[PDB]
Amino acid sequence: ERGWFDILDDWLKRDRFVFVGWSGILLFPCAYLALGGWLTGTTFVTSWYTHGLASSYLEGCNFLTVAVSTPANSMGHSLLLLWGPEAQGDFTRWCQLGGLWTFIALHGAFGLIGFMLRQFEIARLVGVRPYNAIAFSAPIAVFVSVFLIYPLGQSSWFFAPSFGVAAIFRFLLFFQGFHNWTLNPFHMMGVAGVLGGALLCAIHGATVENTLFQDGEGASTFRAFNPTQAEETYSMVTANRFWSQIFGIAFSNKRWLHFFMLFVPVTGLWMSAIGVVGLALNLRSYDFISQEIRAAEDPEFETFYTKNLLLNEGIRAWMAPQDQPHENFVFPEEVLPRGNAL
Amino acid sequence: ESANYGYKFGQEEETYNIVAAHGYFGRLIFQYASFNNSRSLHFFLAAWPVVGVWFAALGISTMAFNLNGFNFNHSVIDAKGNVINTWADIINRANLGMEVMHERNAHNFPLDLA
Amino acid sequence: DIDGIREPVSGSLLYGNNIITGAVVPSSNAIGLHFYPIWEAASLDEWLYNGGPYQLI
Amino acid sequence: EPNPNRQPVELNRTSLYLGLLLILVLALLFSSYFFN
Amino acid sequence: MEVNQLGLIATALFVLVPSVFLIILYVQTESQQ
Protein backbone atom coordinates (compact mmCIF):
# COMPACT_ATOMS: atom_id res chain seq x y z
CA GLU A 1 0.00 0.00 0.00
CA ARG A 2 2.24 2.78 -1.34
CA GLY A 3 -0.19 5.68 -1.61
CA TRP A 4 0.66 9.36 -1.62
CA PHE A 5 0.86 9.50 2.19
CA ASP A 6 3.56 6.88 2.24
CA ILE A 7 5.49 8.49 -0.64
CA LEU A 8 5.37 11.82 1.15
CA ASP A 9 6.51 10.02 4.31
CA ASP A 10 9.47 8.69 2.31
CA TRP A 11 10.44 12.14 1.11
CA LEU A 12 10.05 13.84 4.51
CA LYS A 13 12.33 11.34 6.22
CA ARG A 14 15.19 11.27 3.69
CA ASP A 15 18.62 11.37 5.27
CA ARG A 16 19.65 14.86 4.16
CA PHE A 17 21.89 17.57 5.62
CA VAL A 18 18.91 19.07 7.40
CA PHE A 19 16.39 16.45 8.43
CA VAL A 20 12.81 17.53 7.78
CA GLY A 21 10.26 14.93 8.90
CA TRP A 22 6.56 15.58 9.47
CA SER A 23 7.41 17.74 12.47
CA GLY A 24 9.39 19.91 10.12
CA ILE A 25 6.18 21.15 8.55
CA LEU A 26 5.31 22.79 11.83
CA LEU A 27 8.79 23.51 13.09
CA PHE A 28 10.48 25.28 10.18
CA PRO A 29 8.02 28.00 9.19
CA CYS A 30 7.15 28.86 12.81
CA ALA A 31 10.76 28.96 13.97
CA TYR A 32 11.75 30.86 10.86
CA LEU A 33 8.90 33.29 11.36
CA ALA A 34 9.74 33.82 14.99
CA LEU A 35 13.37 34.47 14.22
CA GLY A 36 12.73 36.70 11.26
CA GLY A 37 10.10 38.44 13.33
CA TRP A 38 12.51 39.28 16.06
CA LEU A 39 15.11 40.39 13.51
CA THR A 40 12.69 42.56 11.60
CA GLY A 41 11.25 44.17 14.74
CA THR A 42 14.54 44.89 16.46
CA THR A 43 15.88 46.31 13.23
CA PHE A 44 12.99 48.43 12.09
CA VAL A 45 10.04 48.65 14.45
CA THR A 46 9.38 51.23 17.18
CA SER A 47 7.75 50.92 20.61
CA TRP A 48 6.77 54.57 20.64
CA TYR A 49 3.01 54.09 20.47
CA THR A 50 2.86 51.20 22.92
CA HIS A 51 5.53 52.05 25.49
CA GLY A 52 6.95 55.45 24.60
CA LEU A 53 10.27 53.77 23.77
CA ALA A 54 12.68 53.61 20.86
CA SER A 55 13.51 49.94 20.34
CA SER A 56 15.08 49.43 16.93
CA TYR A 57 18.43 49.85 15.23
CA LEU A 58 16.63 52.27 12.92
CA GLU A 59 16.00 54.55 15.91
CA GLY A 60 19.56 54.37 17.24
CA CYS A 61 19.30 51.49 19.72
CA ASN A 62 22.12 48.99 19.96
CA PHE A 63 22.03 45.20 20.36
CA LEU A 64 21.45 45.50 24.12
CA THR A 65 18.58 48.00 23.91
CA VAL A 66 16.60 46.88 20.84
CA ALA A 67 13.45 44.89 21.36
CA VAL A 68 10.20 43.69 20.06
CA SER A 69 8.10 45.24 22.79
CA THR A 70 4.75 44.04 24.07
CA PRO A 71 1.52 45.65 22.86
CA ALA A 72 -0.13 48.56 24.64
CA ASN A 73 -1.96 47.71 27.81
CA SER A 74 -5.14 48.86 26.10
CA MET A 75 -4.92 45.86 23.73
CA GLY A 76 -5.65 43.52 26.65
CA HIS A 77 -4.90 39.94 25.68
CA SER A 78 -5.80 40.43 22.03
CA LEU A 79 -4.33 37.88 19.65
CA LEU A 80 -3.53 40.97 17.59
CA LEU A 81 -3.98 39.07 14.36
CA LEU A 82 -2.90 41.07 11.31
CA TRP A 83 -6.41 40.67 9.87
CA GLY A 84 -7.94 41.29 13.28
CA PRO A 85 -10.18 44.15 14.43
CA GLU A 86 -7.33 46.25 15.80
CA ALA A 87 -4.94 46.32 12.84
CA GLN A 88 -7.62 45.57 10.26
CA GLY A 89 -5.16 44.20 7.72
CA ASP A 90 -2.86 47.20 7.93
CA PHE A 91 0.73 45.93 8.23
CA THR A 92 2.17 49.26 9.32
CA ARG A 93 -0.42 49.88 12.05
CA TRP A 94 -0.03 46.26 13.11
CA CYS A 95 3.68 46.90 13.66
CA GLN A 96 2.94 50.10 15.58
CA LEU A 97 0.31 48.39 17.74
CA GLY A 98 2.67 45.59 18.83
CA GLY A 99 1.43 42.86 16.48
CA LEU A 100 4.93 41.51 16.10
CA TRP A 101 4.95 40.58 19.76
CA THR A 102 2.02 38.17 19.55
CA PHE A 103 3.34 37.06 16.15
CA ILE A 104 6.71 36.11 17.62
CA ALA A 105 5.32 34.65 20.86
CA LEU A 106 2.75 32.46 19.09
CA HIS A 107 4.88 31.32 16.15
CA GLY A 108 7.54 30.74 18.81
CA ALA A 109 5.22 28.60 20.91
CA PHE A 110 4.24 26.46 17.94
CA GLY A 111 7.88 26.39 16.92
CA LEU A 112 8.85 24.93 20.28
CA ILE A 113 6.10 22.34 19.93
CA GLY A 114 7.56 21.56 16.51
CA PHE A 115 11.06 21.18 17.88
CA MET A 116 10.00 18.76 20.59
CA LEU A 117 7.96 16.76 18.03
CA ARG A 118 11.18 16.73 15.99
CA GLN A 119 13.05 15.25 18.93
CA PHE A 120 10.41 12.53 19.21
CA GLU A 121 10.35 11.87 15.46
CA ILE A 122 14.09 11.57 15.07
CA ALA A 123 14.34 9.51 18.28
CA ARG A 124 11.80 7.08 16.86
CA LEU A 125 13.54 6.85 13.47
CA VAL A 126 17.01 6.25 14.92
CA GLY A 127 15.99 3.87 17.72
CA VAL A 128 16.95 5.79 20.85
CA ARG A 129 14.83 6.57 23.94
CA PRO A 130 13.10 9.96 23.86
CA TYR A 131 14.76 11.48 26.93
CA ASN A 132 16.01 14.50 25.03
CA ALA A 133 12.44 15.51 24.20
CA ILE A 134 11.37 14.86 27.78
CA ALA A 135 14.21 17.09 28.94
CA PHE A 136 13.07 19.76 26.53
CA SER A 137 9.74 19.85 28.37
CA ALA A 138 11.45 22.18 30.83
CA PRO A 139 12.25 25.07 28.36
CA ILE A 140 8.67 24.73 27.09
CA ALA A 141 7.29 25.06 30.65
CA VAL A 142 9.42 28.13 31.16
CA PHE A 143 8.46 29.75 27.89
CA VAL A 144 4.77 29.03 28.28
CA SER A 145 4.55 30.15 31.91
CA VAL A 146 6.57 33.37 31.44
CA PHE A 147 5.45 34.58 27.98
CA LEU A 148 1.87 33.28 27.91
CA ILE A 149 0.43 32.31 31.29
CA TYR A 150 2.00 35.17 33.26
CA PRO A 151 0.57 38.01 31.12
CA LEU A 152 -2.70 36.10 30.76
CA GLY A 153 -3.03 36.32 34.55
CA GLN A 154 -2.26 40.01 34.43
CA SER A 155 -4.14 42.86 32.74
CA SER A 156 -2.66 42.45 29.27
CA TRP A 157 0.24 41.27 27.13
CA PHE A 158 1.97 44.56 28.07
CA PHE A 159 3.41 43.00 31.21
CA ALA A 160 4.80 39.95 29.46
CA PRO A 161 8.51 40.05 28.80
CA SER A 162 9.49 42.09 25.77
CA PHE A 163 11.90 40.36 23.41
CA GLY A 164 15.18 42.14 23.98
CA VAL A 165 18.23 42.07 26.23
CA ALA A 166 17.58 45.24 28.26
CA ALA A 167 13.83 44.65 28.09
CA ILE A 168 14.40 41.30 29.82
CA PHE A 169 16.62 42.95 32.43
CA ARG A 170 13.72 45.30 33.12
CA PHE A 171 11.52 42.21 33.49
CA LEU A 172 13.90 40.89 36.16
CA LEU A 173 13.93 44.16 38.09
CA PHE A 174 10.16 44.46 37.85
CA PHE A 175 9.79 40.98 39.33
CA GLN A 176 12.05 41.93 42.20
CA GLY A 177 10.26 45.23 42.92
CA PHE A 178 6.67 44.12 42.47
CA HIS A 179 6.76 40.39 43.13
CA ASN A 180 9.72 40.04 45.50
CA TRP A 181 10.48 37.11 43.23
CA THR A 182 13.86 36.35 44.85
CA LEU A 183 11.95 35.46 48.04
CA ASN A 184 9.90 32.85 46.20
CA PRO A 185 10.91 29.28 47.07
CA PHE A 186 9.93 28.10 43.57
CA HIS A 187 12.40 30.55 42.08
CA MET A 188 14.90 29.34 44.68
CA MET A 189 14.45 25.79 43.47
CA GLY A 190 14.94 26.98 39.91
CA VAL A 191 18.18 28.72 40.89
CA ALA A 192 19.32 25.56 42.61
CA GLY A 193 18.53 23.58 39.46
CA VAL A 194 20.34 25.91 37.10
CA LEU A 195 23.45 26.45 39.23
CA GLY A 196 23.42 22.76 40.23
CA GLY A 197 23.20 22.00 36.53
CA ALA A 198 26.11 24.24 35.64
CA LEU A 199 28.03 22.69 38.50
CA LEU A 200 27.33 19.15 37.30
CA CYS A 201 28.27 20.14 33.76
CA ALA A 202 31.65 21.49 34.90
CA ILE A 203 32.40 18.76 37.38
CA HIS A 204 31.43 15.86 35.13
CA GLY A 205 33.34 17.33 32.23
CA ALA A 206 36.45 18.05 34.27
CA THR A 207 36.33 14.66 36.00
CA VAL A 208 36.14 12.84 32.69
CA GLU A 209 38.96 14.91 31.22
CA ASN A 210 41.18 14.23 34.29
CA THR A 211 40.61 10.49 34.65
CA LEU A 212 41.36 9.67 31.00
CA PHE A 213 43.21 6.47 30.18
CA GLN A 214 46.38 7.01 28.22
CA ASP A 215 45.04 5.57 24.96
CA GLY A 216 47.51 7.36 22.72
CA GLU A 217 51.06 8.69 22.70
CA GLY A 218 50.33 12.34 21.91
CA ALA A 219 50.21 15.19 24.41
CA SER A 220 46.83 16.10 22.91
CA THR A 221 44.58 13.49 24.47
CA PHE A 222 41.63 14.17 22.18
CA ARG A 223 43.06 11.97 19.43
CA ALA A 224 43.10 8.90 21.64
CA PHE A 225 39.38 8.25 21.31
CA ASN A 226 37.40 6.29 18.74
CA PRO A 227 33.59 6.72 18.49
CA THR A 228 33.11 2.98 17.93
CA GLN A 229 35.48 1.74 20.64
CA ALA A 230 33.88 -0.50 23.29
CA GLU A 231 36.08 0.48 26.25
CA GLU A 232 35.35 3.39 28.54
CA THR A 233 37.72 6.26 27.76
CA TYR A 234 38.13 7.35 31.39
CA SER A 235 38.39 5.47 34.67
CA MET A 236 35.17 5.47 36.63
CA VAL A 237 36.99 3.68 39.47
CA THR A 238 39.70 6.30 39.88
CA ALA A 239 37.09 9.06 39.51
CA ASN A 240 35.05 7.40 42.25
CA ARG A 241 37.99 7.13 44.62
CA PHE A 242 39.09 10.71 43.98
CA TRP A 243 35.71 12.16 44.72
CA SER A 244 35.04 9.80 47.63
CA GLN A 245 38.22 11.04 49.27
CA ILE A 246 37.88 14.74 48.33
CA PHE A 247 34.18 15.21 48.99
CA GLY A 248 32.99 12.14 50.94
CA ILE A 249 30.62 10.77 48.37
CA ALA A 250 30.93 10.01 44.70
CA PHE A 251 28.95 8.54 41.82
CA SER A 252 29.52 4.82 41.23
CA ASN A 253 26.77 4.33 38.67
CA LYS A 254 27.19 6.01 35.26
CA ARG A 255 23.60 5.63 34.22
CA TRP A 256 22.49 7.22 37.46
CA LEU A 257 25.07 10.01 36.93
CA HIS A 258 23.78 10.97 33.51
CA PHE A 259 20.18 10.61 34.59
CA PHE A 260 20.93 12.97 37.47
CA MET A 261 22.40 15.45 35.00
CA LEU A 262 19.11 15.24 33.14
CA PHE A 263 17.09 15.51 36.34
CA VAL A 264 18.57 18.53 38.12
CA PRO A 265 18.15 21.43 35.63
CA VAL A 266 14.93 20.05 34.12
CA THR A 267 13.28 19.87 37.55
CA GLY A 268 14.63 23.30 38.52
CA LEU A 269 13.14 24.92 35.44
CA TRP A 270 9.79 23.21 36.07
CA MET A 271 9.75 24.54 39.65
CA SER A 272 10.49 28.13 38.55
CA ALA A 273 7.68 27.68 36.05
CA ILE A 274 5.26 26.86 38.83
CA GLY A 275 6.29 29.94 40.77
CA VAL A 276 5.72 32.20 37.77
CA VAL A 277 2.27 30.65 37.32
CA GLY A 278 1.67 31.86 40.86
CA LEU A 279 2.90 35.36 39.98
CA ALA A 280 0.37 35.47 37.14
CA LEU A 281 -2.22 35.94 39.87
CA ASN A 282 0.05 38.08 42.08
CA LEU A 283 0.04 35.06 44.32
CA ARG A 284 3.45 36.09 45.63
CA SER A 285 5.84 35.05 48.30
CA TYR A 286 6.09 38.76 49.15
CA ASP A 287 6.09 38.95 52.93
CA PHE A 288 6.74 37.13 56.11
CA ILE A 289 3.75 38.14 58.24
CA SER A 290 5.51 37.53 61.59
CA GLN A 291 8.35 39.86 60.48
CA GLU A 292 5.90 42.58 59.52
CA ILE A 293 3.96 42.41 62.78
CA ARG A 294 7.16 42.57 64.80
CA ALA A 295 8.58 45.42 62.67
CA ALA A 296 5.38 47.43 62.70
CA GLU A 297 5.39 47.28 66.50
CA ASP A 298 9.12 47.52 67.07
CA PRO A 299 10.99 50.31 65.24
CA GLU A 300 14.34 48.83 66.28
CA PHE A 301 13.69 45.49 64.60
CA GLU A 302 15.56 45.29 61.30
CA THR A 303 16.44 42.38 59.06
CA PHE A 304 17.71 41.90 55.50
CA TYR A 305 14.11 41.04 54.67
CA THR A 306 12.79 44.51 55.75
CA LYS A 307 15.81 46.13 54.06
CA ASN A 308 14.94 44.46 50.78
CA LEU A 309 11.36 45.54 51.08
CA LEU A 310 12.57 49.16 51.28
CA LEU A 311 14.47 48.49 48.04
CA ASN A 312 11.30 47.11 46.39
CA GLU A 313 9.32 50.14 47.44
CA GLY A 314 11.95 52.32 45.80
CA ILE A 315 11.86 50.27 42.60
CA ARG A 316 8.08 50.55 42.36
CA ALA A 317 7.86 54.25 43.08
CA TRP A 318 10.70 55.29 40.77
CA MET A 319 10.07 53.02 37.80
CA ALA A 320 6.25 52.81 37.70
CA PRO A 321 5.40 56.07 35.85
CA GLN A 322 7.76 55.49 32.94
CA ASP A 323 7.34 51.71 32.93
CA GLN A 324 3.54 51.93 32.97
CA PRO A 325 2.72 55.02 30.86
CA HIS A 326 -0.91 54.01 30.33
CA GLU A 327 -1.52 54.43 34.07
CA ASN A 328 -0.60 58.11 33.90
CA PHE A 329 1.11 58.02 37.28
CA VAL A 330 2.02 61.50 38.41
CA PHE A 331 4.15 61.13 41.51
CA PRO A 332 5.19 64.56 42.86
CA GLU A 333 8.80 64.68 44.12
CA GLU A 334 7.57 64.99 47.68
CA VAL A 335 5.89 61.55 47.71
CA LEU A 336 8.92 59.68 46.33
CA PRO A 337 10.49 57.36 48.91
CA ARG A 338 14.16 58.35 49.39
CA GLY A 339 16.70 57.81 52.13
CA ASN A 340 18.73 60.71 53.49
CA ALA A 341 20.67 62.80 50.93
CA LEU A 342 20.22 60.45 47.93
CA GLU B 1 14.01 -3.07 37.06
CA SER B 2 15.89 0.19 37.17
CA ALA B 3 17.95 0.72 34.01
CA ASN B 4 20.82 1.77 36.32
CA TYR B 5 21.45 -1.83 37.32
CA GLY B 6 22.45 -2.33 33.68
CA TYR B 7 25.68 -0.57 34.64
CA LYS B 8 28.09 -2.20 37.06
CA PHE B 9 30.79 -0.11 38.77
CA GLY B 10 34.22 -0.66 37.23
CA GLN B 11 33.01 -2.44 34.09
CA GLU B 12 35.41 -2.04 31.18
CA GLU B 13 32.80 -1.45 28.45
CA GLU B 14 30.80 1.75 27.88
CA THR B 15 27.20 1.65 29.09
CA TYR B 16 25.68 3.65 26.26
CA ASN B 17 26.15 3.89 22.51
CA ILE B 18 27.79 7.20 21.62
CA VAL B 19 27.32 6.46 17.90
CA ALA B 20 23.53 6.23 18.37
CA ALA B 21 23.48 9.43 20.44
CA HIS B 22 25.56 11.15 17.80
CA GLY B 23 23.28 9.91 15.01
CA TYR B 24 20.28 11.25 16.88
CA PHE B 25 21.61 14.68 17.93
CA GLY B 26 23.36 15.10 14.63
CA ARG B 27 20.06 14.64 12.86
CA LEU B 28 18.39 16.95 15.41
CA ILE B 29 20.56 19.86 14.27
CA PHE B 30 22.94 18.83 11.55
CA GLN B 31 25.74 16.30 11.57
CA TYR B 32 28.62 18.67 12.19
CA ALA B 33 27.08 20.29 15.26
CA SER B 34 27.18 16.99 17.20
CA PHE B 35 30.22 15.61 19.06
CA ASN B 36 31.50 12.19 18.01
CA ASN B 37 34.50 12.41 20.33
CA SER B 38 33.62 11.86 23.99
CA ARG B 39 36.82 13.50 25.15
CA SER B 40 36.27 16.71 23.25
CA LEU B 41 32.60 16.66 24.25
CA HIS B 42 33.36 16.29 27.98
CA PHE B 43 36.01 18.96 27.63
CA PHE B 44 33.35 21.26 26.21
CA LEU B 45 31.10 20.41 29.21
CA ALA B 46 33.97 21.39 31.48
CA ALA B 47 35.08 24.52 29.64
CA TRP B 48 31.81 26.35 28.97
CA PRO B 49 30.48 26.91 32.51
CA VAL B 50 34.00 27.27 33.92
CA VAL B 51 34.97 30.04 31.49
CA GLY B 52 31.57 31.66 31.95
CA VAL B 53 31.82 31.73 35.74
CA TRP B 54 35.37 33.03 35.45
CA PHE B 55 33.87 35.94 33.56
CA ALA B 56 31.12 36.42 36.13
CA ALA B 57 33.75 36.50 38.87
CA LEU B 58 35.85 38.95 36.90
CA GLY B 59 32.70 41.04 36.50
CA ILE B 60 32.26 41.32 40.24
CA SER B 61 35.99 41.84 40.71
CA THR B 62 36.22 44.67 38.19
CA MET B 63 33.02 46.39 39.21
CA ALA B 64 34.80 46.32 42.59
CA PHE B 65 36.85 49.12 41.05
CA ASN B 66 33.77 50.82 39.62
CA LEU B 67 34.22 49.96 35.98
CA ASN B 68 30.53 49.50 35.59
CA GLY B 69 27.92 48.20 33.16
CA PHE B 70 27.03 49.93 29.92
CA ASN B 71 25.34 53.27 30.42
CA PHE B 72 22.94 54.27 27.67
CA ASN B 73 20.94 56.63 29.84
CA HIS B 74 19.51 59.23 27.45
CA SER B 75 21.59 57.77 24.60
CA VAL B 76 18.74 58.30 22.14
CA ILE B 77 17.78 61.87 21.37
CA ASP B 78 15.33 63.22 18.75
CA ALA B 79 15.90 66.07 16.24
CA LYS B 80 15.03 68.77 18.78
CA GLY B 81 16.96 67.13 21.61
CA ASN B 82 14.08 65.43 23.44
CA VAL B 83 15.17 62.32 25.27
CA ILE B 84 13.66 59.25 23.64
CA ASN B 85 13.57 56.57 26.35
CA THR B 86 14.75 53.07 25.63
CA TRP B 87 14.60 49.99 27.83
CA ALA B 88 17.97 51.14 29.20
CA ASP B 89 16.24 54.18 30.67
CA ILE B 90 13.50 52.10 32.28
CA ILE B 91 16.22 50.00 33.85
CA ASN B 92 17.76 53.26 35.04
CA ARG B 93 14.47 54.22 36.72
CA ALA B 94 14.44 50.92 38.65
CA ASN B 95 18.13 51.37 39.52
CA LEU B 96 17.27 54.83 40.89
CA GLY B 97 14.64 53.35 43.19
CA MET B 98 17.23 50.98 44.55
CA GLU B 99 19.88 53.66 44.93
CA VAL B 100 17.71 56.15 46.77
CA MET B 101 16.22 53.65 49.18
CA HIS B 102 19.32 51.60 50.05
CA GLU B 103 20.86 52.19 53.44
CA ARG B 104 18.34 54.97 53.98
CA ASN B 105 20.13 56.56 56.97
CA ALA B 106 23.79 56.13 56.01
CA HIS B 107 24.27 58.94 53.52
CA ASN B 108 24.75 62.61 54.40
CA PHE B 109 26.13 63.89 51.12
CA PRO B 110 24.50 63.76 47.66
CA LEU B 111 26.73 61.20 45.90
CA ASP B 112 27.17 57.64 46.99
CA LEU B 113 30.83 57.30 45.97
CA ALA B 114 31.44 53.96 47.65
CA ASP C 1 25.77 47.45 63.23
CA ILE C 2 26.62 46.59 59.60
CA ASP C 3 26.66 50.15 58.21
CA GLY C 4 28.31 51.69 61.22
CA ILE C 5 25.50 54.11 61.98
CA ARG C 6 24.54 52.53 65.31
CA GLU C 7 21.60 50.85 63.58
CA PRO C 8 22.03 47.14 64.35
CA VAL C 9 20.60 44.60 61.95
CA SER C 10 19.22 41.36 63.33
CA GLY C 11 20.60 38.28 61.59
CA SER C 12 20.25 35.28 63.94
CA LEU C 13 17.36 32.85 64.46
CA LEU C 14 17.06 33.62 68.17
CA TYR C 15 16.63 37.31 67.37
CA GLY C 16 13.58 37.05 65.17
CA ASN C 17 14.85 35.51 61.96
CA ASN C 18 13.82 32.52 60.00
CA ILE C 19 16.02 30.45 57.63
CA ILE C 20 15.28 32.79 54.75
CA THR C 21 15.85 36.13 56.50
CA GLY C 22 18.71 35.08 58.72
CA ALA C 23 22.34 35.99 58.16
CA VAL C 24 25.71 36.44 59.65
CA VAL C 25 25.85 40.19 59.16
CA PRO C 26 28.92 41.87 57.60
CA SER C 27 31.24 43.75 59.94
CA SER C 28 30.63 47.42 60.65
CA ASN C 29 31.33 50.19 58.15
CA ALA C 30 33.26 52.00 60.90
CA ILE C 31 35.80 49.19 60.74
CA GLY C 32 36.17 49.42 56.94
CA LEU C 33 39.00 47.12 55.87
CA HIS C 34 40.58 47.09 59.31
CA PHE C 35 41.44 43.66 60.65
CA TYR C 36 39.10 42.94 63.58
CA PRO C 37 40.06 39.73 65.34
CA ILE C 38 38.46 38.92 68.71
CA TRP C 39 41.53 40.13 70.57
CA GLU C 40 41.24 43.60 69.03
CA ALA C 41 37.93 43.99 70.84
CA ALA C 42 37.60 45.13 74.43
CA SER C 43 34.95 42.46 74.94
CA LEU C 44 33.11 39.75 73.07
CA ASP C 45 30.01 41.97 73.32
CA GLU C 46 31.82 44.72 71.42
CA TRP C 47 33.09 42.24 68.86
CA LEU C 48 29.57 40.92 68.29
CA TYR C 49 28.06 44.40 68.03
CA ASN C 50 30.60 45.31 65.37
CA GLY C 51 30.21 42.13 63.37
CA GLY C 52 33.50 40.35 64.10
CA PRO C 53 32.05 36.89 63.37
CA TYR C 54 31.72 37.86 59.67
CA GLN C 55 35.44 38.52 59.43
CA LEU C 56 36.43 35.37 61.32
CA ILE C 57 34.17 33.26 59.13
CA GLU D 1 -5.84 -17.79 43.87
CA PRO D 2 -2.50 -15.90 44.05
CA ASN D 3 -2.29 -12.92 41.71
CA PRO D 4 0.64 -13.44 39.31
CA ASN D 5 1.26 -9.72 38.83
CA ARG D 6 2.77 -9.13 42.25
CA GLN D 7 6.32 -7.76 42.13
CA PRO D 8 8.79 -7.11 44.91
CA VAL D 9 9.60 -3.48 45.65
CA GLU D 10 13.03 -2.09 46.37
CA LEU D 11 14.70 0.99 47.71
CA ASN D 12 18.44 0.79 48.10
CA ARG D 13 20.41 2.65 50.72
CA THR D 14 21.75 5.31 48.38
CA SER D 15 18.17 6.04 47.34
CA LEU D 16 17.24 6.25 51.03
CA TYR D 17 20.00 8.82 51.61
CA LEU D 18 19.05 10.81 48.53
CA GLY D 19 15.39 10.76 49.47
CA LEU D 20 16.00 11.74 53.07
CA LEU D 21 18.22 14.60 51.87
CA LEU D 22 15.52 15.80 49.46
CA ILE D 23 12.75 15.71 52.12
CA LEU D 24 14.90 17.40 54.77
CA VAL D 25 16.19 20.12 52.46
CA LEU D 26 12.68 20.76 51.17
CA ALA D 27 11.49 21.05 54.78
CA LEU D 28 14.34 23.39 55.64
CA LEU D 29 13.32 25.51 52.67
CA PHE D 30 9.55 25.58 53.09
CA SER D 31 9.37 25.69 56.88
CA SER D 32 9.94 29.49 57.03
CA TYR D 33 6.97 29.93 54.72
CA PHE D 34 4.81 27.53 56.75
CA PHE D 35 5.55 29.55 59.87
CA ASN D 36 5.31 32.81 57.88
CA MET E 1 7.22 36.27 66.85
CA GLU E 2 3.64 35.74 65.73
CA VAL E 3 4.21 32.79 63.45
CA ASN E 4 1.42 30.60 62.15
CA GLN E 5 1.34 27.81 64.76
CA LEU E 6 0.12 25.18 62.25
CA GLY E 7 3.57 25.66 60.72
CA LEU E 8 4.88 23.33 63.38
CA ILE E 9 2.69 20.38 62.55
CA ALA E 10 2.87 21.18 58.84
CA THR E 11 6.61 20.96 58.99
CA ALA E 12 6.59 17.88 61.19
CA LEU E 13 4.31 15.88 58.97
CA PHE E 14 6.15 17.22 55.92
CA VAL E 15 9.25 15.60 57.27
CA LEU E 16 7.85 12.48 58.91
CA VAL E 17 5.37 11.09 56.39
CA PRO E 18 7.66 10.88 53.34
CA SER E 19 10.71 10.02 55.42
CA VAL E 20 8.89 7.15 57.03
CA PHE E 21 7.77 6.10 53.59
CA LEU E 22 11.39 5.76 52.52
CA ILE E 23 12.40 4.03 55.69
CA ILE E 24 9.72 1.39 55.28
CA LEU E 25 10.85 0.79 51.72
CA TYR E 26 14.47 0.60 52.70
CA VAL E 27 14.11 -1.76 55.62
CA GLN E 28 11.94 -4.33 53.86
CA THR E 29 14.47 -4.19 51.01
CA GLU E 30 17.30 -5.10 53.39
CA SER E 31 15.27 -7.88 55.00
CA GLN E 32 14.97 -9.59 51.59
CA GLN E 33 17.70 -12.17 50.95
Binding site: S244 | Q11 | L13, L14 | S31 | V3, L8, V15
Partner: peptide, 30 residues
Protein backbone atom coordinates in the same frame (compact mmCIF):
# COMPACT_ATOMS: atom_id res chain seq x y z
CA UNK F 1 9.32 26.71 68.37
CA UNK F 2 10.36 27.83 64.88
CA UNK F 3 13.96 28.05 66.00
CA UNK F 4 13.88 24.57 67.43
CA UNK F 5 12.32 23.36 64.21
CA UNK F 6 14.94 25.03 61.96
CA UNK F 7 17.88 23.83 64.05
CA UNK F 8 16.39 20.35 64.29
CA UNK F 9 16.02 19.95 60.55
CA UNK F 10 19.55 21.30 60.10
CA UNK F 11 20.94 18.87 62.69
CA UNK F 12 19.21 15.96 60.90
CA UNK F 13 20.86 16.97 57.66
CA UNK F 14 24.31 16.95 59.31
CA UNK F 15 23.61 13.53 60.82
CA UNK F 16 22.57 12.39 57.36
CA UNK F 17 25.94 13.60 55.97
CA UNK F 18 27.66 11.47 58.54
CA UNK F 19 25.79 8.34 57.57
CA UNK F 20 25.89 8.87 53.82
CA UNK F 21 29.62 9.27 54.02
CA UNK F 22 30.72 6.64 56.53
CA UNK F 23 27.88 4.15 56.28
CA UNK F 24 27.41 4.21 52.55
CA UNK F 25 26.97 1.27 50.23
CA UNK F 26 30.56 0.42 49.36
CA UNK F 27 31.32 0.77 45.66
CA UNK F 28 32.40 -2.71 44.56
CA UNK F 29 34.27 -3.32 41.31
CA UNK F 30 32.87 -6.08 39.06
Amino acid sequence: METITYVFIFACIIALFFFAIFFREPPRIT
